[PDB]
Amino acid sequence: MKEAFKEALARFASGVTVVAARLGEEERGMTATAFMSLSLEPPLVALAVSERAKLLPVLEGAGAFTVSLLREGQEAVSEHFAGRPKEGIALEEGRVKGALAVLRCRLHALYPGGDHRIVVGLVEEVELGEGGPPLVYFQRGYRRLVWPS
Amino acid sequence: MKEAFKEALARFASGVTVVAARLGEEERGMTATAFMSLSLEPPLVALAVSERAKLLPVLEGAGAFTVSLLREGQEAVSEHFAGRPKEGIALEEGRVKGALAVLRCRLHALYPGGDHRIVVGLVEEVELGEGGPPLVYFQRGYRRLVWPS
C-alpha cells in the first residue's frame, strides 16, 4: 500500500540520528531519519517518533532527550537502535559516542502526527565531535557523500 | 549567538525541497531543507516554514501546497526559491518540473514552532520523476551522493 508515496519518501536523502531518553536507570535509544531543525529563537528541533515506539513513554516521562547525528561508518549504531542488535554498541552519557554532534533537549511540545507523534525539543546543550562526512540514508540504504581529500 | 547549535544543524545532511502554494492570483515557491516524513496512515509529511516567509500566508489561505524534491543539478532552482534569483527558473503546474518527486498536499494541520511554523500536509497526489541522485545540503553547501552504491 502507498507504494508511490513510499517511493517519494525514499527519494528524500537525510542524515541518520539516534534519539535517546532516560528515566532513572531505564534508557532507550531509537534510530530516526525523521528529524529537522525548527527554530533558532528559541532553539528548537522536531522529529517524528512512532506512536508504537518504546522510546515515546520514556521520553515523555523524562521530559527530556538527546539527538545524536551519526557519521560515516556508523551503520552498526544505526542498525542497533533500529531494533537490530549489534555487539559493542551502547549509549554513553545518554547519547552516541563519536557522533558528528549531540543535541540535549528538554521536551517543548508533543503534537499529533498520524501514526507518529511530532516531538519538539528545546536545545539546552550541544556537543560536537570531530568533523567529517555523515551517515546518509537514501533509496532504502546507507549512502556516502562525495567528500574527497 | 547559537554558534554551536548552528554548527550541529550544519552537520545534519538533507535533501532539498521547494514548497509551493497558490492563492487566487498569487503563487509562491520557497526552498526548504526542513522536511520529514511523518506518517503512513494517514500519509503525512511535516515541514518547518519561517514565520517571516511570504509563502506562509498563501499556503494557509490555499489550504493546499506542493513539495518538490530536487535532483542533482537543480542547485539553481534551490537558490532561486531561496531568495537568490536565477534566469528562467519558474514553477510549472504549481511545482518544480524535473524534480525527483512531487507531493501534492492538502493542509492537514499547523502548529507553533518558535520562529517557524510546523506545517503538516496530507498527501493526496504523488508525482515521480525519472530516477537519479538527489540535491543534498550539508555543512553550508550543496553536496552530491556517491551514487550508485
**DSSP letters along chain A, please?**
--HHHHHHHTTS-EE-EEEEEEETTEEEEEEES-EEEEETTTTEEEEEEETT-THHHHHHHHTEEEEEEPBTT-HHHHHHTTT---TT---BTTB-TT-SEEEEEEEEEEEEETTEEEEEEEEEEEEE----PBPEEETTEEE-B----
Structure letter (DSSP) for residue B148: -
* B138 assigned to a ligand binding site: yes
- What three-state secondary structure class fits B6? helix
Resolution (A): 1.6
SS3 B37: strand
Cell numbers that stand for B2 in this block: 547559537
Residue with cell 525514499: A10
Question: For B134, which of A4, A13, A39 is closest by C-beta distance?
Answer: A13
A97 grid coordinates: 559516542
Environment class of B69 (CB within 10 Å of its CB; exposed 0-12, middle 13-18, buried 19+): buried
Domain count for chain B, please give it: 1
Place of cell 520557497: B30
Cβ contact B127:B104 at 8 Å: yes
Distance of CA A96 to the CA centre of its chain: 10
B65 among the known binding-site residues? no
Residue A95 cell numbers, joined: 547519547
In angstroms, the CA B45 to CA B75 distance is 23
Q: What gap in Å lies between CA A43 and CA B4, rounded to an integer?
A: 11
Instruction: Looking at chain B, list the stretches that DSSP marks H as alpha helix, in order from N- to C-terminal side.
Output: 3-9, 55-62, 75-80
A112-143 burial, b for 16+ CB within 10 Å, e for fewer?
ebbebbbbbbbbeebbebeeebbbbbbbeebb
**What is the experimental method?**
X-ray
Euclidean distance between CA atoms B123 and B37, whole angstroms: 11
- State whether the Cα torsion A50-A66-A86-A23 is positive or negative: negative
Q: Is A37 within any annotated ligand binding site? A: yes
User: Is A12 close to B134, i.e. CB distance below 8 A?
Assistant: yes
Q: Which structural domain, as residue segments, surrounds residue A81?
A: 1-149
Under 8 Å between Cβ of B31 and B78: yes
* Cβ-defined contact of B34 to A38 (cutoff 8 Å): yes
Integer Cα distance of B31 and A87 in angstroms? 41
Q: Give the phi and the psi of residue B57 in degrees, each rounded to 5.
A: -65, -30
| Closest in B4, B120, B143 to A126, CB measured | B4
* C-alpha span between A143 and A125 (Å, rounded): 29
CA distance B27 to B58: 7
* Chosen from A9, A102, A106 to mutate, greatest number of chain B CBs within 10 A: A9
A68 is in an annotated binding site: no
C-beta atoms surrounding A9 within 10 Å: 24
How far A65 CA lies from chain B's nearest CA (Å)?
16
Nearest CA among A14, A7, A119 for reference residue A59: A119
CB contact under 8 A, A40 and B114: yes
Of B40, B114, B138, the CB nearest to A115: B40
Phi-psi label, residue B26: left if phi above 0, alpha if psi -120 to 50, beta otherwise: beta
Q: What is the CATH number of the domain that holds A83?
A: 2.30.110.10
